Every structure is written in structure tokens, then in C-alpha cells.
Amino acid sequence: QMEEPAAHDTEATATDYHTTSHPGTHKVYVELQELVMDEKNQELRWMEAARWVQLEENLGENGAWGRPHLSHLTFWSLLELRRVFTKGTVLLDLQETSLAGVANQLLDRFIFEDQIRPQDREELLRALLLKHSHAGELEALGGVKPAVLTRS
């Protein structure tokens, strides 16, 4: 434990992990969840905000989804998406079948690529493994409010 080594950032053997399988084609379903907090217990959790079935539907503050519509984006959203994708962390053909394993691998690669500090790993693992609520239990709670994860 004398030295904590720095990342080499070498892809000499990157091609050794490239599979020869041909991926299939599917019209996919995309779900968006935002880290929010409830009002009845002030507990932070994951609540779905919008879903994509090739058309976008949004969930309002009444427990019912909005009308379907085409997805439209702001300039700043795409600019920031490009900015964070350029230096982003990718885990392709990952052999994981659980959310905990995916979160652990993502945090390990975040620490390896200096995306996050090692002291933030516990908090991020706690946040990513929170309960994922949906529109069915929105009325069971006191609603959802925007939340920001703190140091504690």
C-alpha cells in the first residue's frame, strides 16, 4: 500500500476483448429516471420522468403520463451531452446482469479514468442503488421534489 499507481491509459490489448458476434436490431424502449426526493418522508430515490417508445411521453405531478410527442432538445442539452460524451466513460460488452454489478464496474472505471475521486465512490454507490420508484407509487407518496445528493 506504499504507492497508489496512476492509470496507464493504454489500449494495446483493446482488440483482444472485441467480440465477433453480430448484434441484433430492435426498436427499443428508453426510460429516463431522475434522482428526486419525496415530500412525505424526505427520502431521496429514483423516479421515472419520461419514457421513449419512439415517441416521448412525460410524467407530470399528478401520477399520469402526458400525451405522446416527438422528442425536442435544447441547444445547451446537446452541447453538454457532447462535452460529457467526449471525455465519457464507456463499458462496452460488460458481463453484468445486476444493477449493483453495473454500478460497481462503472464506479471502478470512473476512479480509474479520474472521473470521480475515490472518496465519492461510497456516496455514488449509495445513490445508484436507491429504490427505483415509478408512476404507480407516485400517489402512494406525497409527491416528488427535485433533490441534490450531498456529501453526507
Binding site: 490489448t13 482488440t15 483482444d16 476483448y17 472485441h18 465477433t20
Partner: peptide, 15 residues
């Protein structure tokens, strides 16, 4: 890195 990359390079020719 194991037998899998060797097999992939022997069959496909890439690697």
C-alpha cells in the same frame, strides 16, 4: 490474454 483472442484472430483474421 487467453485462447479467445487467439481463436478470433485465427478465424476472422482481425486482432
Amino acid at each position: 490474454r487467453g485462447s479467445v483472442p487467439i481463436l478470433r484472430q485465427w478465424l476472422t483474421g482481425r486482432g
